[PDB]
Amino acid sequence: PRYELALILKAMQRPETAATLKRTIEALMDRGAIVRDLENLGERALPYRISAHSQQHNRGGYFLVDFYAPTAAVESMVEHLSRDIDVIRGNIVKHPLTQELKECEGIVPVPLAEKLYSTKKR
Amino acid sequence: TKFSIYPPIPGEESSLRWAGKKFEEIPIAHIKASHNNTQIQVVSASNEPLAFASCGTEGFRNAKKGTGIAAQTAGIAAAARAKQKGVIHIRVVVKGLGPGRLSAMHGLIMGGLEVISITDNTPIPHXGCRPRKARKL
Amino acid sequence: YHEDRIRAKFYSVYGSGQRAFDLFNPNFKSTCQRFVEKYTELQKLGETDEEKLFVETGKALLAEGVILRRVG
Amino acid sequence: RQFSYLIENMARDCGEYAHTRYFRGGMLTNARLLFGPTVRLPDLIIFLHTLNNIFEPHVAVRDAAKMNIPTVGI
Amino acid sequence: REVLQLQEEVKNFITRENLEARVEAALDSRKNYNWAITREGLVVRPQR
Amino acid sequence: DPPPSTLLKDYQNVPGIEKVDDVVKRLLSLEMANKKEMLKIKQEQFMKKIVANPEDTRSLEARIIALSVKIRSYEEHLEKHRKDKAHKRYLLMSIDQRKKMLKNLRNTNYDVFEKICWGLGIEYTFPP
Amino acid sequence: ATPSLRGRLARFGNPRKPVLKPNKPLILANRVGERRREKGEATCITEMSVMMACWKQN
Amino acid sequence: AKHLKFIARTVMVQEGNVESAYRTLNRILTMDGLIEDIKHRRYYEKPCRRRQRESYERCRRIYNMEMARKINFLMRKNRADPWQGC
Amino acid sequence: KNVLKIRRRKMNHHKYRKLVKKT
Amino acid sequence: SNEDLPISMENPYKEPLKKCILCGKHVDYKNVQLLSQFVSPFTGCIYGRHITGLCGKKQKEITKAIKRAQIMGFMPVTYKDPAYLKDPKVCNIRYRE
RNA sequence: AAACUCCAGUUGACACAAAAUAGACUACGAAAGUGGCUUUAACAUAUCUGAACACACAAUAGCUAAGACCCAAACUGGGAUUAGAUACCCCACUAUGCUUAGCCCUAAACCUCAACAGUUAAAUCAACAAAACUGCUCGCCAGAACACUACGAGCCACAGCUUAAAACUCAAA
Ligand SMILES: [K+]
Ligand SMILES: [Mg+2]
Ligand SMILES: [Mg+2]
Ligand SMILES: [Mg+2]
Ligand SMILES: [Mg+2]
Ligand SMILES: [Mg+2]
Ligand SMILES: [Mg+2]
Ligand SMILES: [Mg+2]
Ligand SMILES: [Mg+2]
Ligand SMILES: [Mg+2]
Ligand SMILES: [Mg+2]
Ligand SMILES: [Mg+2]
Ligand SMILES: [Mg+2]
Ligand SMILES: [Mg+2]
Ligand SMILES: [Mg+2]
Ligand SMILES: [Mg+2]
Ligand SMILES: [Mg+2]
Ligand SMILES: [Mg+2]
Ligand SMILES: [Mg+2]
Ligand SMILES: [Mg+2]
Ligand SMILES: [Mg+2]
Ligand SMILES: [Mg+2]
Ligand SMILES: [Mg+2]
Ligand SMILES: [Mg+2]
Ligand SMILES: [Mg+2]
Ligand SMILES: [Mg+2]
Ligand SMILES: [Mg+2]
Ligand SMILES: [Mg+2]
Ligand SMILES: [Mg+2]
Ligand SMILES: [Mg+2]
Ligand SMILES: [Mg+2]
Ligand SMILES: [Mg+2]
Ligand SMILES: [Mg+2]
Ligand SMILES: [Mg+2]
């Protein structure tokens, strides 16, 4: 079904980052995925230090990859992202828009529990 | 401006100064208040040791070390050796919930040092090593 | 009661007015009660639309000098 | 306690008796000991308030039933 | 209705043709998922 | 197994789906769906092969066919996960429940019982 | 707001395992706990330490 | 070890009043439950014992919050006797 | 309830295990 | 008979059911600014529903979203993001008093 | 006191271990169990009850074979306490707790409160505990101790488990 790849890339120059995004997308297409949209949330300092491929990363660029792939394509893509040295962190999750939020009527007050003990005169 | 209890961010620009030194350049006074002993070490911003003191190095041994007055004695001594190297303002990073958690900080104040920030860095594992078994007291 | 729906709508749109209730008087008629009486009379004409009937009832009290300050 | 003053005055005006104070135990069931061997118990008890100050049934309500004394209670 | 809606969306998707151009477009544009909530339920947008 | 190019059960009857782009057809196929949606087509295939009225979902034949599809999934699920104890009990209860359904169907409608066994490849055995 | 007590205790109606196992019935008493006296602590230790420090020096 | 330092659980001392800052830091740790967490982590609490302690605290919280509500509810009756002598 | 019944089985089981271990 | 007898109805004065501040709004693990509004500014501890005031459904959503963001490099764990320290205050908690 | 001093404090690198806060939530699973994150598969039955001759599971501890080493820790060693201390306190360390495969089949496996369908009326009801009952079915129980035992039988179990007596004894338990 529809997935979302929370992709955090190493802070590099424009030609290097652009090559990395294309290379990552081609990996999905090589595994039967149908890429929907490529989003750019910007680049900000990582909340905590991340070590990957014997490299210490303090900053990284944020990107989101939306694609349609079979269930078996999810496992293969995770293995691919680990071997990529330019990817700080890559996680594959369900697209939050696929899930439909059920309408909420509100908040029902909870009455105090009653008849928890016998009415005998202790 | 109104005082803010939150420390200034090193990346951001702040107008707060202490003797011409910014918050990131203030030497740090780490305090390790264990249940039986208190170890105080003062280091500068570049992780350069400046002064170190403890109850065991200030005429207290065995159960006497695990007392507030013993920690206070170490705090005064730690301030004295730090003050020789030009330390005036310190940032306190207290670790542990021992009896000398606050008294050791008092020794630094009475020794001629100024406290500008207090930080607690007690190690709390988030699930980690299984601690020792309960005592059958 | 049937008029309780009218009171709920009146308190929702206008709210309690500056006039104070006097429960001592057995024949006391509040602004909300006066609104209900006009609402009942205009209903007997043949109006069956709640929205149209509600607005017309408010206009009648305004023509009679009743102050009707809405919450908005 | 709010209407204790009123009830006592009403009883005096109509020539009847009122007990608006704390009800000592045995005023009805053990009346022959508290007052005397020849005491006469009330032939009718009227409760203007059937609950005590802890929101529980008045003791005299149960006691009057024991002494086969009819009760009129609000 | 959903099939018709979904059919139109594919016309502006990423394929092996619109790969380089779409990558460069992302590197120039930005987005802000982050938003805040008040005590009244009002949504506050980040002004950047 | 149904071909991986087969559309979903919900979208198999929408008009004009034969003239949509091949990209949309791939999305609406079984390839871009989970395993449960595949079982719907598998159950539907038998619901028309065997049941005289495929639209009746409360008949004994529909229940056996629906339960048979679940039993097949557990066998596939336990094939990959040999130490999954939770599904092993579910497999063993579903097998026992199907036999109870087979017993009731055989004792009331024997002619359809032959068709159910033939269609699903079920060899009914009397208990020891 | 008081935590709910619906389904917490093991009862006849409750199908689930109990959430709370109170050693006493959850019924409000007619009395509250008496005020607890503050534990005694050593006082004027700082002043004593300063006074005794000069004695060692003098 | 991998987060930025001098941000978490840091209190700035105002005008050299270290006593107020330390109490503020102590209260923040207590409110977030860090102080109570550290003490119970000194010696391992077995899962059977932890559930018994949690159930006791949860039952304690229910009684404490219910009794507190009644005290506030009846506090308006703490006035003087309006029917003195009756 | 007291554990008097359990204690009797506790001692019987303990002596049985020692007897089994002994012989 | 008598037309003044009470009739059977639902409560017309029944106020609408109260809703949490996040009712009807999506919660996303990438929405760090929203998530940081429900953690302590000094420890990063996730506030309880008695503090945030959220309902049961959104309290679970925020907790799940925070945990996902922390492991995926979107939300700091030990502290609250300083850039979000100036957000509107929606948690009923006071430290300095 | 012993131990350590190849130590401690600050900083950086850095798991086959364990999962703060949320959780004042009360959800899931047949029970046992289940509370870090992601993905896959997936949570039996369109009447109910029903196998202690059946099948599939069953916390922890333990056996078997190959690995992992942080911490905790039977036994053991050292230090102390004590009339003695084969314990409680302190320190060091092993089996073990983890992973893979195969076993073992026990628990206060207890929410000691059977499954389904109902009722809140009468006599509500020994006591206490967690109010009293109806219909139906299955399992189980008939004084205490001997006895979670002997013998027989079955079991990958061999110091084991399951099933389970008798004689003598007591007038109580
Ligand atoms: K955790
Ligand atoms: Mg359940
Ligand atoms: Mg008890
Ligand atoms: Mg108290
Ligand atoms: Mg780490
Ligand atoms: Mg007892
Ligand atoms: Mg014996
Ligand atoms: Mg020594
Ligand atoms: Mg270190
Ligand atoms: Mg683990
Ligand atoms: Mg685990
Ligand atoms: Mg907790
Ligand atoms: Mg998970
Ligand atoms: Mg999962
Ligand atoms: Mg089920
Ligand atoms: Mg059955
Ligand atoms: Mg087992
Ligand atoms: Mg084991
Ligand atoms: Mg052996
Ligand atoms: Mg081994
Ligand atoms: Mg160790
Ligand atoms: Mg050894
Ligand atoms: Mg020894
Ligand atoms: Mg070991
Ligand atoms: Mg259990
Ligand atoms: Mg039992
Ligand atoms: Mg049964
Ligand atoms: Mg029932
Ligand atoms: Mg009784
Ligand atoms: Mg046994
Ligand atoms: Mg035996
Ligand atoms: Mg025999
Ligand atoms: Mg034998
Ligand atoms: Mg058994």
Cβ-Cβ contacts under 8 Å between G and H: the total is 30
Smallest Cα distance from G42 to chain H, Å: 18
Residue B6: which residues within 8 A CB-CB, separation 6 or more?
A: H10, H12, J41, J82, J85
DSSP string, C39-63: HHHHHHHT---HHHHHHHHHHHHHH
Q: Which chains, if any, share at least 3 CB pairs under 8 A with chain G?
A: A, B, H
Overall number of domains in chain J: 1
Residue J93, CB, strand K, below 7 Å: no
In chain B, the N- to C-terminal Cα span, in Å, equals 54
The contacts of residue C71 (CB under 8 Å, 6+ apart) are C13, C14, C15
Contact (CB, 8 A) for B41 and B54: no
Annotated resolution, angstroms: 3.0
What are the residues whose beta carbons fall under 8 Å from the beta carbon of F84, sequence distance 6 or more? Answer: F77, F78
Q: Which nucleotides of K are covered by protein (CB under 7 A)?
A: 1, 8-15, 17-33, 35-46, 50-51, 55-58, 70-73, 88-91, 97, 101-102, 108, 111-113, 128-132, 145-149, 159-160
Which own/partner contact pairs does A69-72 have at CB distance under 8 Å and 24+ positions apart?
A69/A3, A69/A28, A69/A31, A69/A32, A69/A33, A69/A34, A69/F32, A70/A32, A70/F31, A70/F32, A71/A1, A71/F34, A71/F35
Q: d(Cα A94, Cα A101) in Å, to the nearest integer?
A: 14
Distance between the alpha carbon (CA) of H49 and the C1' atom of K146, Å: 38
Q: Would you state the structure tokens that stand for residue J27, as one six-digit string?
A: 């919660």
Between CA B85 and C1' K29 the distance (Å) reads 66
| Phi, psi of D4, rounded to the nearest 5 degrees | -60, -40
Selected for mutation to probe chain H from D1, D5, D20 (highest H CB count within 10 Å) is D1
Residue type, H5: K
Residue type, J47: Y
Q: Under an 8 A CB cutoff, do J12 and C5 touch? A: yes
Does the nearest atom of strand K lie within 7 Å of H68's Cβ?
no
What determination technique applies here?
Answer: cryo-EM
H22 touches chain B (CB under 8 A): yes
| CA torsion angle F109 F111 F113 F114 (round to 10) | 170
Helix, strand and coil content of chain B, in percent to the nearest 5, comes to 25, 25, 50
J83 touches strand K (CB under 7 A): no
Token pair belonging to B32: 């390790």
In DSSP terms, which residues pair with A45 in a beta bridge?
Answer: A59
- Contact criterion met (CB < 8 Å) for J73 and A108: no
Radius of gyration of chain F (CA): 17
- Phi/psi of residue C52, nearest 5 degrees: -65, -40
Choose among B116, B121, B133: nearest Cβ to H12. B116
The burial of F5, by beta-carbon neighbours within 10 Å (0-12 exposed, 13-18 middle, 19 or more buried), is given as exposed
User: Do A25 and E20 make contact, defined as CB atoms within 8 angstroms?
Assistant: no
Asked if F31 lies within 8 A of A32 by C-beta distance, the reply is: yes
- Looking at the DSSP assignment, which residues form a beta bridge with residue A65? A5, A38
User: Which residue numbers of H have CB closer than 8 Å to D's CBs?
Assistant: 82-83, 86
Q: For H7, phi and psi rounded to 5 degrees?
A: -130, -50
Give dist(CA A62, CA H67) in Å, integer: 52
CA of residue B70 relative to chain centroid, distance: 15
Nucleic strand K contacts from chain G, 18-57, CB < 7 Å: 18-19, 25
Sign of CA dihedral J32, J35, J39, J44: negative
What is the rounded CA–CA span in Å between residue G27 and residue C69?
49
Chain H residue with minimum CA distance to J40: H32
- B130 CA distance to ligand 24 centroid (A)? 14
- Are J43 and H9 within 8 A, CB to CB? yes
Q: In chain B, at which residue ranges do the beta strands (DSSP E only) sit?
A: 28-33, 38-43, 49-54, 89-95, 114-120
C-alpha–C-alpha distance, residues B39 and J51, integer Å? 38
Exposure of I9 in the CB half-sphere (CA atoms within 13 A) = 3
DSSP 8-state code for residue J47: P
C-alpha span between A107 and A95 (Å, rounded): 28
Token output for A116: 């928890």
Residues of A in contact with J76 (CB under 8 A): 47-48
Take residue D67 and report the two structure tokens written for it: 């002494």
Q: Choosing among G20, G24, G31, which should be mutated to test the H contact, i.e. which has the most H CBs within 10 A?
A: G20
- The answer to whether strand K lies under 7 Å from the CB of residue F48 is no
Q: In the Cβ-directed half-sphere of G58, how many Cα atoms lie within 13 Å?
A: 6
| Contact status, residue A87 vs residue A24, Cβ threshold 8 Å | yes
State the residue range of the domain holding J58: 2-97
Structural domains of chain A in order of their starting residue, each with its CATH number: 2-94 (3.30.70.60)
Per CB-CB distance under 8 Å, the chain C contacts of J7 are: 1-2
> Do J76 and H3 meet the contact criterion of CB atoms below 8 Å apart?
yes
- Partner-chain residue, chosen from H6, H14, H43, that has the shortest CB–CB distance to B7: H6
Distance I23 CA to ligand 30 centre (A): 20
> Whole-number Å distance, CA F78 to C1' K106?
29
- In 3-state terms, what secondary structure has residue H39? helix
Record: contact E27-A38, CB cut-off 8 A: no
Contact call for J41 and B9, based on CB within 8 A: no
Q: Which two tokens stand for residue C57?
A: 């009832």
DSSP string, chain A: -EEEEEEEEE---HHHHHHHHHHHHHHHHHTT-EEEEEEEEEEEEEEEEEEETTEEEEEEEEEEEEEE--THHHHHHHHHHHH-TTEEEEEEEE-TTTSPPPPP--B---PPP-SSS-----
